[PDB]
Amino acid sequence: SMNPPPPETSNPNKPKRQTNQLQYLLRVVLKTLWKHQFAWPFQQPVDAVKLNLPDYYKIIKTPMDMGTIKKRLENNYYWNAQECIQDFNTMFTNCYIYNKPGDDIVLMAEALEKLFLQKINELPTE
């Protein structure tokens, strides 16, 4: 079975927390990015089988996607904002590592990342 298991969105052994920053990441940051015209490739784990990209998970060993981030936030999976911001950064970095510059998916990621950075700049104080 060529796809790996997706990243966990819950873990009963991982301490859970709600902070005003994590509330902002779900209510403002994720919601803004999720509805974007370019969001759809990022809304679920890369299906490297269906995309016929057998090398994707040979190259990308820390996969991440906004579907996973959305469920982690809804589940209060995170302890802090940094864990969630790290997942967004991983999602973007994976896209830039795997794909060639100028690819449609790269321009799409760049547009979402510019919007992500705008919203992260307005992160409230804890």
Ligand SMILES: CC(=O)N1c2ccc(C(N)=O)cc2[C@H](Nc2ncc(Cl)cn2)C[C@@H]1C
């Ligand atoms: C996120 C990422 O790097 N990739 C990805 C993931 C999911 C989906 C998809 N079809 O859901 C598609 C892609 C990318 N392919 C693509 N082709 C055309 C357009 Cl208009 C947008 N993307 C490749 C890449 C592995």
